[PDB]
Amino acid sequence: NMSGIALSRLAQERKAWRKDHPFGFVAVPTKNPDGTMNLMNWECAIPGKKGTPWEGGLFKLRMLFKDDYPSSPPKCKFEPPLFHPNVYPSGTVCLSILEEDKDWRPAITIKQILLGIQELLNEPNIQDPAQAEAYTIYCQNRVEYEKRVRAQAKKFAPS
């Protein structure tokens, strides 16, 4: 419908992704009950970065687009929610590029988003806490922090 602009961009994104993407990353649209392809809801997976405490884990994330996309950024949500200073308890990611009033630009691609999030994993934004627990531990006890993360990466290790 009025979603023509969004769908059109979303199809370009899908196409470009298939064409080329980062190793280990996953990004695929969901299927409507009717076996059809729902371009407004993607299921993604981000691999923990090598040489970090996230290393080895495969973190599943859901990307939800609005009718006005790309005017607005998608909503990114970890399923299940991750322990991290910038991830709300709902699993929603707190990241400047994901905010219209902030750093979001219509030209930003899905790949960039995913890479941005991955990057965020090992480089928390202490200035913008989304959750009490992870933020406290991070500040109060780095050691315990990495410990929690490790256990986490381990819990989300792909077969």
Side-chain angles (χ1 to χ4, degrees), residues 112-129:
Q112 289 170 331
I113 293 174
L114 299 179
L115 299 157
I117 296 184
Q118 176 186 64
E119 161 188 81
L120 173 74
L121 301 168
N122 204 236
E123 296 167 44
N125 169 17
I126 208 135
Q127 301 264 102
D128 292 354

PDB file of all heavy atoms in Angstrom, residues 112-129:
ATOM      1  N   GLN A 112      24.999  -2.378   7.755  1.00  0.00           N
ATOM      2  CA  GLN A 112      25.549  -1.391   8.629  1.00  0.00           C
ATOM      3  C   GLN A 112      24.924  -1.495   9.973  1.00  0.00           C
ATOM      4  O   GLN A 112      25.600  -1.401  10.987  1.00  0.00           O
ATOM      5  CB  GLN A 112      25.340   0.017   8.093  1.00  0.00           C
ATOM      6  CG  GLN A 112      26.200   0.348   6.866  1.00  0.00           C
ATOM      7  CD  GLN A 112      25.784   1.654   6.230  1.00  0.00           C
ATOM      8  OE1 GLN A 112      24.614   2.051   6.300  1.00  0.00           O
ATOM      9  NE2 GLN A 112      26.741   2.345   5.651  1.00  0.00           N
ATOM     10  N   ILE A 113      23.607  -1.693   9.988  1.00  0.00           N
ATOM     11  CA  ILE A 113      22.931  -1.839  11.250  1.00  0.00           C
ATOM     12  C   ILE A 113      23.501  -3.008  12.044  1.00  0.00           C
ATOM     13  O   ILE A 113      23.855  -2.883  13.214  1.00  0.00           O
ATOM     14  CB  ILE A 113      21.422  -1.988  11.078  1.00  0.00           C
ATOM     15  CG1 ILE A 113      20.835  -0.690  10.539  1.00  0.00           C
ATOM     16  CG2 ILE A 113      20.782  -2.317  12.423  1.00  0.00           C
ATOM     17  CD1 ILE A 113      19.364  -0.826  10.203  1.00  0.00           C
ATOM     18  N   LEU A 114      23.591  -4.154  11.381  1.00  0.00           N
ATOM     19  CA  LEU A 114      24.101  -5.344  12.017  1.00  0.00           C
ATOM     20  C   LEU A 114      25.529  -5.180  12.488  1.00  0.00           C
ATOM     21  O   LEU A 114      25.884  -5.562  13.589  1.00  0.00           O
ATOM     22  CB  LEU A 114      23.882  -6.603  11.152  1.00  0.00           C
ATOM     23  CG  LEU A 114      22.410  -6.838  10.923  1.00  0.00           C
ATOM     24  CD1 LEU A 114      22.182  -8.059  10.048  1.00  0.00           C
ATOM     25  CD2 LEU A 114      21.713  -7.038  12.254  1.00  0.00           C
ATOM     26  N   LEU A 115      26.327  -4.580  11.684  1.00  0.00           N
ATOM     27  CA  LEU A 115      27.692  -4.372  12.077  1.00  0.00           C
ATOM     28  C   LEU A 115      27.773  -3.421  13.258  1.00  0.00           C
ATOM     29  O   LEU A 115      28.614  -3.566  14.153  1.00  0.00           O
ATOM     30  CB  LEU A 115      28.552  -3.886  10.898  1.00  0.00           C
ATOM     31  CG  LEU A 115      28.585  -4.899   9.771  1.00  0.00           C
ATOM     32  CD1 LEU A 115      28.925  -4.222   8.457  1.00  0.00           C
ATOM     33  CD2 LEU A 115      29.616  -5.959  10.083  1.00  0.00           C
ATOM     34  N   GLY A 116      26.887  -2.431  13.254  1.00  0.00           N
ATOM     35  CA  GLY A 116      26.853  -1.448  14.320  1.00  0.00           C
ATOM     36  C   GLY A 116      26.523  -2.090  15.633  1.00  0.00           C
ATOM     37  O   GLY A 116      27.155  -1.821  16.661  1.00  0.00           O
ATOM     38  N   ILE A 117      25.518  -2.958  15.600  1.00  0.00           N
ATOM     39  CA  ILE A 117      25.101  -3.676  16.778  1.00  0.00           C
ATOM     40  C   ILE A 117      26.245  -4.575  17.293  1.00  0.00           C
ATOM     41  O   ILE A 117      26.632  -4.501  18.443  1.00  0.00           O
ATOM     42  CB  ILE A 117      23.805  -4.452  16.530  1.00  0.00           C
ATOM     43  CG1 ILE A 117      22.686  -3.456  16.239  1.00  0.00           C
ATOM     44  CG2 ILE A 117      23.445  -5.314  17.740  1.00  0.00           C
ATOM     45  CD1 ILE A 117      21.328  -4.113  16.066  1.00  0.00           C
ATOM     46  N   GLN A 118      26.814  -5.385  16.402  1.00  0.00           N
ATOM     47  CA  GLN A 118      27.931  -6.222  16.784  1.00  0.00           C
ATOM     48  C   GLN A 118      28.993  -5.386  17.468  1.00  0.00           C
ATOM     49  O   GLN A 118      29.440  -5.695  18.542  1.00  0.00           O
ATOM     50  CB  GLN A 118      28.544  -6.962  15.595  1.00  0.00           C
ATOM     51  CG  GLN A 118      29.793  -7.774  15.992  1.00  0.00           C
ATOM     52  CD  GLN A 118      30.491  -8.381  14.802  1.00  0.00           C
ATOM     53  OE1 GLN A 118      30.994  -7.663  13.944  1.00  0.00           O
ATOM     54  NE2 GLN A 118      30.491  -9.726  14.731  1.00  0.00           N
ATOM     55  N   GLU A 119      29.351  -4.309  16.856  1.00  0.00           N
ATOM     56  CA  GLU A 119      30.328  -3.468  17.422  1.00  0.00           C
ATOM     57  C   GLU A 119      29.941  -3.020  18.828  1.00  0.00           C
ATOM     58  O   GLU A 119      30.754  -2.995  19.730  1.00  0.00           O
ATOM     59  CB  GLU A 119      30.661  -2.291  16.518  1.00  0.00           C
ATOM     60  CG  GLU A 119      31.327  -1.158  17.291  1.00  0.00           C
ATOM     61  CD  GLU A 119      31.496   0.088  16.478  1.00  0.00           C
ATOM     62  OE1 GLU A 119      30.604   0.894  16.289  1.00  0.00           O
ATOM     63  OE2 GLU A 119      32.695   0.214  15.998  1.00  0.00           O
ATOM     64  N   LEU A 120      28.677  -2.707  19.004  1.00  0.00           N
ATOM     65  CA  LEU A 120      28.180  -2.275  20.278  1.00  0.00           C
ATOM     66  C   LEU A 120      28.388  -3.331  21.368  1.00  0.00           C
ATOM     67  O   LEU A 120      28.557  -3.022  22.538  1.00  0.00           O
ATOM     68  CB  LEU A 120      26.679  -1.867  20.185  1.00  0.00           C
ATOM     69  CG  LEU A 120      26.043  -1.569  21.544  1.00  0.00           C
ATOM     70  CD1 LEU A 120      26.534  -0.214  22.084  1.00  0.00           C
ATOM     71  CD2 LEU A 120      24.514  -1.542  21.416  1.00  0.00           C
ATOM     72  N   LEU A 121      28.334  -4.567  20.985  1.00  0.00           N
ATOM     73  CA  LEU A 121      28.457  -5.637  21.945  1.00  0.00           C
ATOM     74  C   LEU A 121      29.652  -5.512  22.866  1.00  0.00           C
ATOM     75  O   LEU A 121      29.519  -5.662  24.077  1.00  0.00           O
ATOM     76  CB  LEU A 121      28.384  -7.048  21.328  1.00  0.00           C
ATOM     77  CG  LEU A 121      27.090  -7.323  20.580  1.00  0.00           C
ATOM     78  CD1 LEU A 121      27.241  -8.603  19.771  1.00  0.00           C
ATOM     79  CD2 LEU A 121      25.930  -7.465  21.556  1.00  0.00           C
ATOM     80  N   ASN A 122      30.831  -5.303  22.299  1.00  0.00           N
ATOM     81  CA  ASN A 122      32.029  -5.214  23.123  1.00  0.00           C
ATOM     82  C   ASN A 122      32.477  -3.800  23.418  1.00  0.00           C
ATOM     83  O   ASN A 122      33.522  -3.586  23.987  1.00  0.00           O
ATOM     84  CB  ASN A 122      33.188  -6.066  22.607  1.00  0.00           C
ATOM     85  CG  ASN A 122      34.153  -6.429  23.716  1.00  0.00           C
ATOM     86  OD1 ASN A 122      35.361  -6.156  23.620  1.00  0.00           O
ATOM     87  ND2 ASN A 122      33.610  -7.011  24.798  1.00  0.00           N
ATOM     88  N   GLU A 123      31.679  -2.850  23.020  1.00  0.00           N
ATOM     89  CA  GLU A 123      31.983  -1.475  23.267  1.00  0.00           C
ATOM     90  C   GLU A 123      30.754  -0.747  23.782  1.00  0.00           C
ATOM     91  O   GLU A 123      30.161   0.066  23.088  1.00  0.00           O
ATOM     92  CB  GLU A 123      32.558  -0.786  22.025  1.00  0.00           C
ATOM     93  CG  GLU A 123      33.909  -1.378  21.581  1.00  0.00           C
ATOM     94  CD  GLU A 123      34.328  -0.924  20.203  1.00  0.00           C
ATOM     95  OE1 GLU A 123      34.228   0.238  19.823  1.00  0.00           O
ATOM     96  OE2 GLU A 123      34.808  -1.904  19.466  1.00  0.00           O
ATOM     97  N   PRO A 124      30.371  -1.059  24.992  1.00  0.00           N
ATOM     98  CA  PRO A 124      29.190  -0.468  25.579  1.00  0.00           C
ATOM     99  C   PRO A 124      29.257   1.028  25.683  1.00  0.00           C
ATOM    100  O   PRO A 124      30.323   1.610  25.708  1.00  0.00           O
ATOM    101  CB  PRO A 124      29.002  -1.113  26.944  1.00  0.00           C
ATOM    102  CG  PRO A 124      30.043  -2.211  27.061  1.00  0.00           C
ATOM    103  CD  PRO A 124      30.910  -2.156  25.809  1.00  0.00           C
ATOM    104  N   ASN A 125      28.081   1.660  25.697  1.00  0.00           N
ATOM    105  CA  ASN A 125      27.978   3.111  25.832  1.00  0.00           C
ATOM    106  C   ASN A 125      27.525   3.468  27.233  1.00  0.00           C
ATOM    107  O   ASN A 125      26.326   3.523  27.528  1.00  0.00           O
ATOM    108  CB  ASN A 125      27.068   3.727  24.789  1.00  0.00           C
ATOM    109  CG  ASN A 125      26.727   5.177  25.054  1.00  0.00           C
ATOM    110  OD1 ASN A 125      27.396   5.873  25.851  1.00  0.00           O
ATOM    111  ND2 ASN A 125      25.693   5.658  24.365  1.00  0.00           N
ATOM    112  N   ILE A 126      28.509   3.703  28.078  1.00  0.00           N
ATOM    113  CA  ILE A 126      28.318   3.976  29.480  1.00  0.00           C
ATOM    114  C   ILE A 126      27.485   5.182  29.747  1.00  0.00           C
ATOM    115  O   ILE A 126      26.949   5.358  30.844  1.00  0.00           O
ATOM    116  CB  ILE A 126      29.643   4.073  30.195  1.00  0.00           C
ATOM    117  CG1 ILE A 126      29.462   3.677  31.647  1.00  0.00           C
ATOM    118  CG2 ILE A 126      30.183   5.506  30.098  1.00  0.00           C
ATOM    119  CD1 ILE A 126      30.562   2.744  32.146  1.00  0.00           C
ATOM    120  N   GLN A 127      27.380   6.009  28.765  1.00  0.00           N
ATOM    121  CA  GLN A 127      26.604   7.181  28.899  1.00  0.00           C
ATOM    122  C   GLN A 127      25.127   6.926  28.704  1.00  0.00           C
ATOM    123  O   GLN A 127      24.316   7.764  28.992  1.00  0.00           O
ATOM    124  CB  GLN A 127      27.072   8.252  27.919  1.00  0.00           C
ATOM    125  CG  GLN A 127      28.548   8.635  28.130  1.00  0.00           C
ATOM    126  CD  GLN A 127      28.719   9.868  29.010  1.00  0.00           C
ATOM    127  OE1 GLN A 127      29.043   9.757  30.200  1.00  0.00           O
ATOM    128  NE2 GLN A 127      28.497  11.046  28.424  1.00  0.00           N
ATOM    129  N   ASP A 128      24.780   5.800  28.159  1.00  0.00           N
ATOM    130  CA  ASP A 128      23.389   5.553  27.868  1.00  0.00           C
ATOM    131  C   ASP A 128      22.926   4.242  28.307  1.00  0.00           C
ATOM    132  O   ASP A 128      22.580   3.419  27.475  1.00  0.00           O
ATOM    133  CB  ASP A 128      23.119   5.655  26.368  1.00  0.00           C
ATOM    134  CG  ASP A 128      23.261   7.035  25.838  1.00  0.00           C
ATOM    135  OD1 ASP A 128      23.460   8.009  26.550  1.00  0.00           O
ATOM    136  OD2 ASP A 128      23.166   7.082  24.530  1.00  0.00           O
ATOM    137  N   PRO A 129      22.853   4.047  29.604  1.00  0.00           N
ATOM    138  CA  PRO A 129      22.413   2.777  30.164  1.00  0.00           C
ATOM    139  C   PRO A 129      20.956   2.487  29.872  1.00  0.00           C
ATOM    140  O   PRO A 129      20.075   3.329  30.067  1.00  0.00           O
ATOM    141  CB  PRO A 129      22.608   2.867  31.679  1.00  0.00           C
ATOM    142  CG  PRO A 129      22.969   4.314  31.986  1.00  0.00           C
ATOM    143  CD  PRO A 129      23.182   5.027  30.646  1.00  0.00           C
TER     144      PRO A 129
END
